[PDB]
Amino acid sequence: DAVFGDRVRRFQEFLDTFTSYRDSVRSIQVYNSNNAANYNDNILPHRIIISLDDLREFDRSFWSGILVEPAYFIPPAEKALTDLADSMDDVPHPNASAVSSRHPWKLSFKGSFGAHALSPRTLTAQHLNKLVSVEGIVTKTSLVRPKLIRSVHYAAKTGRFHYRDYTDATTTLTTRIPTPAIYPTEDTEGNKLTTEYGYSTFIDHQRITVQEMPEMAPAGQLPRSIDVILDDDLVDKTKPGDRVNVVGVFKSLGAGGMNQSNSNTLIGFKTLILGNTVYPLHAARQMLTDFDIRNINKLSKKKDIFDILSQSLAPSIYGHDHIKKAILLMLMGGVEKNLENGSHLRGDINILMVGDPSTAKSQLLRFVLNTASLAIATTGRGSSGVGLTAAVTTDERRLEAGAMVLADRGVVCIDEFDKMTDVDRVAIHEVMEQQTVTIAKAGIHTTLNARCSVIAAANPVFGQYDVNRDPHQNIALPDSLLSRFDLLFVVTDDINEIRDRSISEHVLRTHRYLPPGYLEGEPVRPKLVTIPFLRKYVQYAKERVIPQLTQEAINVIVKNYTDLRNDDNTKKSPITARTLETLIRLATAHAKVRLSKTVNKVDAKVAANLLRFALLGED
Amino acid sequence: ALPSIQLPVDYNNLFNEITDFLVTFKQDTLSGPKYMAMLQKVANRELNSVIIDLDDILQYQNEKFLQGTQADDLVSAIQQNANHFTELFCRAIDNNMPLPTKEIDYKDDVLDVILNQRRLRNEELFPPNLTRRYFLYFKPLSQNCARRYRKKAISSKPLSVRQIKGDFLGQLITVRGIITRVSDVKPAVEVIAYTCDQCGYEVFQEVNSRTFTPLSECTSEECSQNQTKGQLFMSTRASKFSAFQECKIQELSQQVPVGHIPRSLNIHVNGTLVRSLSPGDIVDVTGIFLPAPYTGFKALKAGLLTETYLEAQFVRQHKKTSDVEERVMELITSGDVYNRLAKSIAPEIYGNLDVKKALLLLLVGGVDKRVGDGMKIRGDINVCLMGDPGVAKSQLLKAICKISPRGVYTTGKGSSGVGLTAAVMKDPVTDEMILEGGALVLADNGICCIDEFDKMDESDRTAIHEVMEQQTISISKAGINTTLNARTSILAAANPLYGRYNPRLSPLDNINLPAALLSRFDILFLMLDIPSRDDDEKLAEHVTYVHMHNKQPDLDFTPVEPSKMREYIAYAKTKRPVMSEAVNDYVVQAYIRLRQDSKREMDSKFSFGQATPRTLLGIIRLSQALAKLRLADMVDIDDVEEALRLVRVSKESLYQE
DNA sequence: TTTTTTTT
C-alpha cells in the first residue's frame, strides 16, 4: 500500500531520469493517434522495454526489488508508467469502449540479467517468485483464445453501467481472491443487468512450451521444458520450433497435493513463467543501415559487379563460374507477375546440374543452402513425394506440410534428385509449375502456396555423363520435367593437367586456410564482397527493385528464343515456351542485380549468353 | 461492488433516435417510410426477417447532422456493442409496429388463436419475443462509401480468423473465408411455455442460455390461489421455436501466414438466414462476435478463459434479372458472341482459339435429357487435352477453374481416387464410418480440372469412369451403401507417353489410354508443339507484351469480363433447345460415314479408335451447346457441321503434321 | 485385440 505508492512515485522519478522512455511513450501515443486519423482502410501496443541497467544505476534498491520480488515492484512500476502515459497523453474524444478500455501500459526489460538468466533445465524452485529469463525452443504452441477481464454491464431500468473486473493467477502477479467468474446478472439493488459486450474488456491468452536447447540437452536425458503464459501483444509472437529467449516471472500455482481433496499428496505445485517480454533468437532476417544501403548503391555503380558477386559465391569451389552466376540470378529470383484475371506468372528460377560423383555439386548446393536466407535441404532417396509436397495427417485429419510448402517464398534444394522416385517427381511437377500444391486425399481437398524456388542436383544415368550418348540417354528425367525445370547445367570431369593442378592448388590453399585468431596446431573453437554483405545486398535488391521489361530487351529475348527453338541444332533439352519464360526471368534477375527498375538490353543479352552456354553448350 | 461507470451513451436517447429514424427514414434519395413499409409487410406477415442497413443509418445521421442534431452516432454505436442495440431495435420495431393490413396470416396460428384467449381469461405479462415473429438483422456498412474513413479503420474490411482479436468481442465484424463444414438445422426455443391443469395458467419461461433447467413447479397465481402445487408440463405448441444451424469458416490459404495452420471460427446462424450458407464455398460474412459461456462445471474448469463464436447478421457470396437482361443484349447486339467469348477466354494465352471455343462449349454444357421410359443421358461434356509439355495446358485449366463459378482444380498425384470421388472416414466421432464428398462431389454442377491425368493411377481412372459417363456415385463401402447424384463436368490434362507425342507411334499408342476411357470423353484434343519461326515470333511478341504490360496486347480484340461471361453463360444454359429432323438425317449420315471410316481406318498411322454411340451423343451435346450459345430454341445444321469441324480439327492436328 | 477405410 504505502510501499506500493512509494514505489509508484519512485518509478515515476526513474522515468523522469530517462526521458528516452517518456519520448518512446509519446511516440507510441502519437503514432497510434495518427494511425486512427485518416484511416482509408496497426496500433503500437502500450508496452515499454525499460533497460534493466538503467534501473540498477538510478536506484539499485528498486532494481534489486524488481529482480527478486517482481510481484511487489513490477505492479507499482507499470502503474506509474500507465499514469505517466495517461497524464502526458491527450486521450482526446475517447470512444465509449475506449473510456471503458482502461488499456494500461506494460513493462519489459533488456539484457543484463546475470544469475536471473537461466535455462529450462537449469531452472530451480528457489527462483520461484523472482524475475528471470531462459532460452530454448518453442513447442506445442497452444492456440490464441479470449479471456474475460472485465464484465461491463448496463443496469436496465436505471440507466447505469456496473462493471466487474476478474482475477486470475496468470493475469495478476500478486495473489488475489479469485473472482467467481460469473457475469453480474442482477444489480445489487435488484435491477436486472445486461452484459454489454465490447464495452466489457477481454484479453488474449496463449500457452506455449519452451524446451531446453537440444544442443544443451545432456546425454541420456529428456530436455526439460517449462510453460510460458503469453498474453496480449505477447500472443502470437512466435511458433513451434522457435529458438528464443524469454523474460518472465517464474511463479507457482495449484495446491501441489496440499489440498484436502488430495489423498496421496505426493505431488508438487504447478509452476509457470508469466512472460513479460520475448526476445526471438534466430541463432533469419538480415539487417540494413543507411550506410550499408549507400555502400550497396555505390557498389551497383560498379559495372561488372554481377561478375564480382558471382565469384564471391562458392569461393571455395572452383571452375563453375557460370553456375555461380546462375545461382546468383536464382537467389535474385526475378519478378513473379500475376494477372488481374487470376493467372499466375512464375518469376522464380530453378537450377540443376548433372555432374560426376564428387563434382562438389552437392557441396555447391550446401553452400547455396547456408548462404540462402531461407532454404530447404533434402535428397532424392531422403525425400518423399508427400513429404516433399504435403502428407495428409490424421492429426481432425489435417494435412502435413511437405518441403515445398515449407519456405514457400524461400528456396529449396535436392541432392541426388535423379535418385528421387519418379512418382514423387511427378508430384513435384505440379508444385514447381503451378507454384502451388493441391491435395484431395483422405477426403481433404486443399490448395497451398508452393512458389518456393528449387535447385536440385543429380548424377547422369550412367554415373559419368557420356558426351557421346544423348542427354536424354544421360538423363533419366523426362524431358517434360526437364523442360518444366529451368536451367540444365551438365558438368563433366576432365583430365586437364593444367586444370587438374589448378584445382589441386585451390583445394590445397583452402586446407591451408588459417583462422586469424588461431595458429598452427590450434584446433578451431579479385575484389569479393563479404558474404553477410552479399546477403544484405540481395535482400535490399529484392526489397527495393522491380525491373521492367524494355522493348529492346523484348526484341532481343524474342529473337533469341525464336531462333533457338527454330535452331535445328541438337539441344540438351527441347526448346519450349517455358524456355521463353526462363529467358524473361533471367533478364529480370540480371536487371535486379543491376538494381534497376527498368530492364536493359544488356541484361537480356547476358541471360541469352548463359542460356546458350547451358542449353547448346559452351558459348 | 458493481461500481457504476459513466460512459458516453444514453440508451434512452439512442432508442428515441432509432424510433425517429425508423418512422422517418425513407430511401428517397434512392427513390411511406421504407422501414415502416417493411414493418407493414411484417404486420401482413409478408416478411419474418428484418434487415436494418447500417448504411441507411449513416444516411439518416448525415441528414440529421446537416439539419443539425445532437446525433448519437448510432451507425458507429452499433459496432461497439451490437447485441444490446439489436434488442433495442426490436423493441422500437414493436413500439412502432403497424397494425395488420389486407388479410392477416393468423388463420390457424396457435399463438394468435390462444394468446387472445389467454388474455380473455386474464380479463410484461408474457415475454415480448414470444409474440415477436420477425427476425431482426443488420446489413454491414458498404465499404464503397467508407464515409467513416478515419472512423472506418477496417470495419467493413473482412478479417481472417487469426485477424480476429478478443478486442472485437461484442462488436459487429466482417470475415472472408471458406465454410469448412455446416451442421444440419435444428430447432431451438426462444421462450418455453409450461401448462399446468391445476392453475390452467400457461407460464412462459424465456431461455437465452445454451441449456436450461425446467421449472417443474407453478408460480402461477391460480395454483398459488388454491395453495395447490403445480405440475408444470412442457407445451411445444405453446413454446416458441426457432431454427438453428452451425457453420465453421476456415482461413484462406492466401490469408494464412506461411508456416501457420489455418484457423477456423464456429458460426451460429438462426432464423431465416439458416441454410443460406453452403459448405466449401468462399463467402464474406458479417455478424456479432460474442463469447460462448460454459456449463457450470466446465466453466469452473476453464475460468476466465471463454469460448468465442460468431452470429452472422448478413452473408455475402463472392459468386452465386432485367439488369442482367440488358447487360446480355448488349453483347448479343455486339454479335459474334461465340468467337468473342472464345477469344475472351484465357486472354493471357495466345492462339489455340479452337481449344478456347471447345472449352466454352464445355462450359455451357450439353442438355441433360430424361426419357419418359426413365432413361437419362448425361448432358455434361468431358474433354481431354493430350499434348506435349509446356504448352500452357495447366494454365488453361486453372483459368477455366477460376472462370466457372463452381469449378475446382485438382492434380492426379495430389488427389487420391477415393478422395477424388468420395472417402469413407472411419472415425469422425465414435468410430462411425462416414462418407466424405470427394473432389467430384465438390465439383457437383461444376467443372473439375485434373492435371497429369496420365500420371493418375489407372485404378482411380477406372473409378472416375463411372462418374464421368454416369453422373451418380454409388458407394457400397463398409457400413455405407449409398448413391450420390454427383452431376459435374470433367476436364483432363495429360501428355503423350514418354512426355511428348511420337509421330512414329500411333495416335492411340501416344495417347496410352483405355478405349473405354477414351470413348467416354466427348472430345480429345491432340495439341502439339512444332517449331515455327513466324508462329514462334508471334507468340513471343504476345508473351513479351503480357510481361511488359499486364494486360495482354489488345490485337484489335475486346475481352468480356469474368462476371459478364458467367452471367451470359448462365442465361445461355437456361435455354435447353430441341433439335430438328433435317439435323437428324444430317447427323445420322455423318455418324454412319464416321463409323464406316473407322471400320476401314484401323491403320495404326491413322487409327484413333473405333467410333461408338457415345461419340454420336457427344456430337449431339456439342450441337446443343452451340445452340445454347446462339440461344436458338432449336439446334441448327450449322451447329452440327461446326461440331463435326471441331472433332475433325482435333483429329487432323496430328494428320496435318 | 479385432476389424477396418484409408493413406503412407
Ligand SMILES: Nc1ncnc2c1ncn2[C@@H]1O[C@H](COP(=O)(O)OP(=O)(O)OP(O)(O)=S)[C@@H](O)[C@H]1O
Ligand atoms: N500459347 C501460350 N500463351 C501463353 N503462355 C503460354 C503459351 N504456351 C505456353 N505458355 C507458357 O509456357 C508455360 C507452359 O507450361 P505450363 O503452363 O506451366 O504447363 P503446361 O506444360 O503448358 O501444361 P501441362 O503439360 O498440362 S503441365 C507456362 O508458363 C505458360 O504460361
Ligand SMILES: Nc1ncnc2c1ncn2[C@@H]1O[C@H](COP(=O)(O)OP(=O)(O)O)[C@@H](O)[C@H]1O
Ligand atoms: N571444381 C571443384 N572445386 C572445388 N572443390 C571440388 C571441385 N570438384 C570437386 N570438389 C570437391 O569434391 C568434394 C566432393 O564433392 P561432392 O559434393 O560429393 O560432389 P558430387 O555431389 O558430384 O558427388 C567436395 O567437398 C568438393 O570440395
Ligand SMILES: [Mg+2]
Ligand atoms: Mg556430392
Ligand SMILES: [Mg+2]
Ligand atoms: Mg500446364
Ligand SMILES: [Zn+2]
Ligand atoms: Zn399450475
